[PDB]
Give the backbone structure.
Amino acid sequence: MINMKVAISMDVDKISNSFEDCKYFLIVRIDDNEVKSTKVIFNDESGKKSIVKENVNAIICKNISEENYKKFSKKIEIYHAEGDDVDKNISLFIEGELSKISNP
């Protein structure tokens, strides 16, 4: 069973085009294969520091920069979103059905 914290790169209406361009990071705690809680971290100068402090297990995004990939892939597994829908993607994540990004 998965017990993990996952960061998702979000626009107000959908998963964003990139980790870099998002409005906010949605921090989801998944426990006994269920979403238990959520939190918004705005993608501003402070939010960029905050996301590191969260110590997430995984990121879900559509695209990510070489720099951010280099930084986060040391510790964090980075998964590629499939379409725009965050709930569909959280489900796919839990099911083990998202692909792990190897190069941005």
Notes: The CA atoms of residues 15 and 83 lie 8 Å apart.
